[PDB]
């Protein structure tokens, strides 16, 4: 919007406002993979950390 | 039954028992009862012979 300037009386004379804008936009995104596995090699005979046999 | 690995602190082995040895004692003549017991107060004992024809 803007001020709206004075205008003389007996001559007709006005102002006029412009239009409005549009745009318009787009957006990727990201992608993240894990991965992991179990052996029988990490059981056998291993002994439990916080106790004995 | 289970113990500590032979190389390691973190692994299990199995423990299979035990073997033993023990000595040979024959003990033969002892269980003939040939000798019989005779008890004495004293640290030597006297004894007497006697025969004739």
């Given at each position: 919007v803007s001020l709206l300037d004075a205008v003389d009386r007996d001559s007709r004379?006005?102002?006029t406002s412009a239009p409005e804008r549009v745009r318009q936009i787009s957006f990727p995104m990201m992608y993240?993979?894990?991965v992991?596995?179990?052996?029988?090699?990490?059981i056998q005979g291993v002994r439990q950390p916080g106790t004995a046999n | 039954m289970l113990?500590?690995?032979e190389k390691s602190r973190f692994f299990l082995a199995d423990l299979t028992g035990e073997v033993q040895s023990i000595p040979n004692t024959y003990g033969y003549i002892s269980?003939?009862?040939?000798?019989?017991?005779?008890?004495?107060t004293q640290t030597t004992f006297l004894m007497d012979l006697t025969d004739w024809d």
């Open positions: 004379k006005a102002e993240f993979k894990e992991e596995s179990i052996t029988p090699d990490e | 113990t500590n690995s269980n003939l009862g040939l000798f019989r017991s005779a008890p004495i």
